[PDB]
Amino acid sequence: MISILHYGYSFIMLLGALYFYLLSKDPKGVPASEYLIAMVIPLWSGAAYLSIALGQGLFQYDDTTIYYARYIDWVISTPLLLAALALTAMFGGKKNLTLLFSLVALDVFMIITGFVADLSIGTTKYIWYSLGVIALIIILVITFGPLRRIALSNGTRLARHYTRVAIYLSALWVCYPTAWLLGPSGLGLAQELTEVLVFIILPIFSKVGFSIVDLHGLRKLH
Amino acid sequence: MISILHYGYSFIMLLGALYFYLLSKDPKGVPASEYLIAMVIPLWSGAAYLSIALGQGLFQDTTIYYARYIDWVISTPLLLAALALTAMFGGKKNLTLLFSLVALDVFMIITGFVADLSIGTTKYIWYSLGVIALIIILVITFGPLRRIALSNGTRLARHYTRVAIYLSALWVCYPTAWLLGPSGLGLAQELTEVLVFIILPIFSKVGFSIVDLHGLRKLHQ
Amino acid sequence: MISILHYGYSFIMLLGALYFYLLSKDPKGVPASEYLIAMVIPLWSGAAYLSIALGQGLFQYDDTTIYYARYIDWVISTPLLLAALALTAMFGGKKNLTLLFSLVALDVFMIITGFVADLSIGTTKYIWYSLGVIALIIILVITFGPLRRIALSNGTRLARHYTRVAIYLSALWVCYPTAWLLGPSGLGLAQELTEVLVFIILPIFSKVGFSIVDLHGLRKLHQ
Ligand SMILES: CCCCCCCC/C=C/CCCCCCCC(=O)O
Ligand SMILES: CCCCCCCC/C=C/CCCCCCCC(=O)O
Numbered sequence: 001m002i003s004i005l006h007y008g009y010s011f012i013m014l015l016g017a018l019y020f021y022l023l024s025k026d027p028k029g030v031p032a033s034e035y036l037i038a039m040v041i042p043l044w045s046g047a048a049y050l051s052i053a054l055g056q057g058l059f060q061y062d063d064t065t066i067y068y069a070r071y072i073d074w075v076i077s078t079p080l081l082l083a084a085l086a087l088t089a090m091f092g093g094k095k096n097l098t099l100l101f102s103l104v105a106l107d108v109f110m111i112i113t114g115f116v117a118d119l120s121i122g123t124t125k126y127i128w129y130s131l132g133v134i135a136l137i138i139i140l141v142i143t144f145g146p147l148r149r150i151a152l153s154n155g156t157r158l159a160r161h162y163t164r165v166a167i168y169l170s171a172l173w174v175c176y177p178t179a180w181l182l183g184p185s186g187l188g189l190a191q192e193l194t195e196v197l198v199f200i201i202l203p204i205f206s207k208v209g210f211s212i213v214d215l216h217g218l219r220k221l222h
Numbered sequence: 223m224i225s226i227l228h229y230g231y232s233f234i235m236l237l238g239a240l241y242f243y244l245l246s247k248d249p250k251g252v253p254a255s256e257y258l259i260a261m262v263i264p265l266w267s268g269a270a271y272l273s274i275a276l277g278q279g280l281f282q283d284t285t286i287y288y289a290r291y292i293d294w295v296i297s298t299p300l301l302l303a304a305l306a307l308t309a310m311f312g313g314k315k316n317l318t319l320l321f322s323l324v325a326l327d328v329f330m331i332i333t334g335f336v337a338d339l340s341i342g343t344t345k346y347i348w349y350s351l352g353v354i355a356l357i358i359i360l361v362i363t364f365g366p367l368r369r370i371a372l373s374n375g376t377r378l379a380r381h382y383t384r385v386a387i388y389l390s391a392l393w394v395c396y397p398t399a400w401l402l403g404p405s406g407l408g409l410a411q412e413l414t415e416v417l418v419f420i421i422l423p424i425f426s427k428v429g430f431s432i433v434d435l436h437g438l439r440k441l442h443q
Numbered sequence: 444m445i446s447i448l449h450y451g452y453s454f455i456m457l458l459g460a461l462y463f464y465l466l467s468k469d470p471k472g473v474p475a476s477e478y479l480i481a482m483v484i485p486l487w488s489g490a491a492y493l494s495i496a497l498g499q500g501l502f503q504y505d506d507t508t509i510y511y512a513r514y515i516d517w518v519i520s521t522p523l524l525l526a527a528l529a530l531t532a533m534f535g536g537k538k539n540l541t542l543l544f545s546l547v548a549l550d551v552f553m554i555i556t557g558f559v560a561d562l563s564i565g566t567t568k569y570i571w572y573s574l575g576v577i578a579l580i581i582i583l584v585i586t587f588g589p590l591r592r593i594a595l596s597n598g599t600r601l602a603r604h605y606t607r608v609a610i611y612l613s614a615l616w617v618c619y620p621t622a623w624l625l626g627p628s629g630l631g632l633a634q635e636l637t638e639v640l641v642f643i644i645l646p647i648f649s650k651v652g653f654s655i656v657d658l659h660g661l662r663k664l665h666q
């Protein structure tokens with residue numbers, strides 16, 4: 001079942017990528033870079049999840065299964081999602097690349113701490129986990145503070161679309177660390193099959209759903 | 223023999239890099255970035271191949287030359303960047319198209335590494351994903367990228383077409399040799415594959431940049 | 444003792460990062476990018492050294508301890524320090540990103556050769572070490588040659604600050620390969636505890652000290 005679910009994920013990711021490629025042919029004022037980012041995210045995620053389906057993207061550490069291919073996915077897909085969010089705030093204005101790369105740096109660190117926490121035992125696990133949550137909070141502060149102020153400087157219609165996408169992404173993103181802590185990597189209150197289903201469903205809303213909402217809004221401003 | 227060949231490769235790479243550095247001192251209207259790219263490719267490839275000569279860049283009942291993937295994950299995207307900048311010479315840069323090629327190429331090299339560590343059908347799933355990536359790269363090279371080269375004039379377009387055909391020919395040889403050699407069907411022997419992955423890279427890591435830079439320098443007059 | 448020293452390092456790195464964040468709030472004509480770089484260097488170094496304190500960032504290779512977390516640190520922190528130096532030379536003028544990325548490329552290669560030398564045995568160790576020293580010499584040539592000429596083109600006051608920070612960084616940087624060769628990774632003349640102290644103290648002068656000197660100088664040019 002675990003294998004079949006991952007094949008299904010990969011096929012959905014492929015269809016998402018094709019959809020964004022079709023939209024790119026009639027761009028409606030959205031620069032090509034934002035279509036390219038929307039295509040890379042699901043293609044990369046699809047390839048990582050395919051490695052899990054084929055039994056390669058996981059190993060047995062102590063008496064637990066580490067799905068290490070999820071970290072390979074997120075270290076590329078999550079910074080690209082933050083870049084898409086930042087470019088949405090900056091649509092029709094000057095780019096602030098310093099703020100964009102600040103988000104990328106926080107995000108890569110967050111994903112690495114999660115990988116190290118998964119390989120850790122005892123208190124050390126929760127030190128790494130905690131550093132990642134701090135990174136996520138600073139990301140949320142930037143998202144609803146300075147980045148939202150840039151979106152307001154680009155006008156009411158853009159600011160409203162930005163706010164909608166920021167809330168959408170922020171809602172997903174708090175679920176990941178929560179699921180991690182409850183599942184076998186953390187306190188073990190939730191079963192492996194439950195965690196697998198969450199980390200199949202959530203990524204569909206994050207790696208394809210976010211880009212549908214984000215690009216449709218920007219296209220409607222044309 | 224395998225060790226000596228790799229030392230020889232590294233020394234050739236060093237001479238190629240020195241040559242490009244000398245050309246950079248009299249640039250003839252070619253931006254410094256294009257000389258830098260031409261220097262990094264052989265120096266990185268040389269260092270990877272040196273690790274094979276010294277017995278470090280491989281592990282073992284099949285021998286995986288993993289240092290080749292370390293080489294290509296840096297050297298192949300830089301070759302596509304040099305090709306893309308050749309098309310765009312004298313005109314507006316399209317960095318979205320350039321980064322699309324880098325992304326496809328890095329993916330292609332990673333699939334090859336995973337295919338080499340894989341057994342049975344799984345090997346050929348990964349191999350196949352890499353071939354699809356390579357086909358999209360060739361479509362971009364002869365389609366949209368060639369259209370940008372045409373928009374920059376007949377002389378540039380002719381040089382672009384020549385270097386594109388040159389690189390496109392090398393590049394189909396790599397996956398073909400991989401499949402026939404010990405990583406794939408095993409029809410060809412280890413020593414044969416070693417010689418192919420010594421000779422081909424000399425044409426790709428030094429030869430391509432001689433052809434590419436000489437053409438661009440000739441457009442100065 | 445080795446663990447406690449690494450915890451102390453990490454806490455100092457955190458305080459350095461907070462200091463640079465505070466300076467950023469009143470930037471005095473220094474672009475945001477230079478404050479961001481000054482913050483990333485100690486935060487990254489802190490996290491790497493924390494992994495050593497917790498017993499994760501090292502392993503036993505035969506009869507030696509490899510502190511591999513140091514290379515994870517330097518592969519990010521050292522190119523960012525060269526970027527800060529290059530941006531100091533280019534302050535008030537056109538950026539030369541080709542020269543900046545030439546320094547990044549040399550530096551990443553230098554750190555990789557060090558990691559491979561540490562995993563190597565016998566003559567092979569000293570081949571890799573040597574390639575890294577050649578990279579470091581080319582970096583020093585660029586620093587005192589073309590990069591210093593760019594600093595001169597941006598005025599006497601900038602050029603004087605550039606020269607001061609370049610000498611500061613150049614002194615630190617020759618110490619790293621010297622300590623490496625004398626310690627357990629090389630000739631083994633110095634003991635593990637000695638090398639650990641050097642690779643706690645030097646990084647404090649490089650990962651926080653450099654950025655205090657560099658940013659204070661640039662902020663003084665606003666007045
Ligand atoms: C934790 C790993 C860190 C890796 C990422 C490093 C990020 C630091 C780089 C900073 C680049 C700054 C962006 C360039 C500024 C251009 C001007 C602007 O639009 O603000
Ligand atoms: C698949 C492995 C990892 C690859 C990651 C590559 C990232 C691709 C995203 C880059 C965005 C491109 C930005 C171009 C900006 C300028 C736009 C233009 O003028 O065309």
Ligand SMILES: CCCCCCCC/C=C/CCCCCCCC(=O)O
Nearest residue numbers: 255262538539540541544548551552
């Ligand atoms: C050893 C691994 C090396 C990896 C990094 C190599 C980088 C090579 C690429 C060169 C990019 C140069 C940027 C050119 C921008 C032109 C504008 C300018 O010069 O100011």
